[PDB]
Amino acid sequence: AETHGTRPDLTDQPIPDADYTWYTDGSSFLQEGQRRAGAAVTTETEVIWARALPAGTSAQRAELIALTQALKMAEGKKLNVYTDSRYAFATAHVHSEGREIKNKNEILALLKALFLPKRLSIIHCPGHQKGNSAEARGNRMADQAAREAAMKAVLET
Ligand SMILES: [Mg+2]
């Protein structure tokens, strides 16, 4: 059992009896001078949810938002969720003591959402993998979906 965490039964390895295995990604890039962002939750082949986010949204914030959405949609179910964000992983797994100086709203929302799934593992996966393994395909799908959502919104459709 992890220590100095927020949800005592949270693990970082896949649970055998998971209902859902999902992949999250937050995308942030510069376009026409401003920072743009998107977030997504996917399986290897399906987009469960993807949205463009407000201008100025950092990649870190987008990653928190994507992970939060996965937790919300998995309320009452057993979830393995993969993120390639070290920031989102650490925010979910390690409790901090001080006032949150950045992303305070998104951190609070994530911490609340941790408690929604019946059982939960938040797992790190490498990003930009070339394989056709489940993790490679899932992470790729989430990255593509988040970037597509962000691009479509900036271009207006
Ligand atoms: Mg990512």
How far apart are alpha carbons 131 and 49 in whole angstroms?
Answer: 23
How far apart are alpha carbons 26 and 11 in whole angstroms?
Answer: 22
Experimental method: X-ray
How far apart are alpha carbons 63 and 48 in whole angstroms?
Answer: 16
What length is written for the chain?
157
Report the CATH number that the domain containing residue 91 is assigned in CATH: 3.30.420.10
CA of residue 1 to ligand 1 center, whole Å: 26
CB atoms inside a 10 Å sphere around CB 133: 12
Range of the domain at 138: 1-157
CA of residue 82 to ligand 1 center, whole Å: 10
**Beta-bridge partners for 49:** 41
Phi, psi dihedrals of residue 37, rounded to the nearest 5°: -150, 155
Task: Name, in order, each residue with C-beta under 8 angstroms of 125's C-beta and a sequence gap of 6 or more.
Answer: 23, 82, 83, 84, 135, 138, 139
Cα three-residue angle 24-145-85, rounded to 5 degrees: 30
Tokens representing 45 are 């082949």
**DSSP secondary structure, 41-85, as one string:** EE-SS-EEEEEEE-TT--HHHHHHHHHHHHHHHTBTSEEEEEE--
Tokens 């949810």, located at residue: 49
Resolution of the deposited coordinates, in angstroms? 1.5
Amino acid at 141: M
C-alpha pair distances (Å), 89 with each of 18, 34, 94, 100: 19, 27, 8, 16
109's enclosing H/E stretch is: helix 104-113
Half-sphere exposure of 4 (CA within 13 A, CB side): 6
CA of residue 88 to ligand 1 center, whole Å: 9
CA of residue 108 to ligand 1 center, whole Å: 20
CA of residue 63 to ligand 1 center, whole Å: 7
CA of residue 47 to ligand 1 center, whole Å: 15
Phi, psi dihedrals of residue 40, rounded to the nearest 5°: -150, 155
Q: How many domains does the chain have?
A: 1
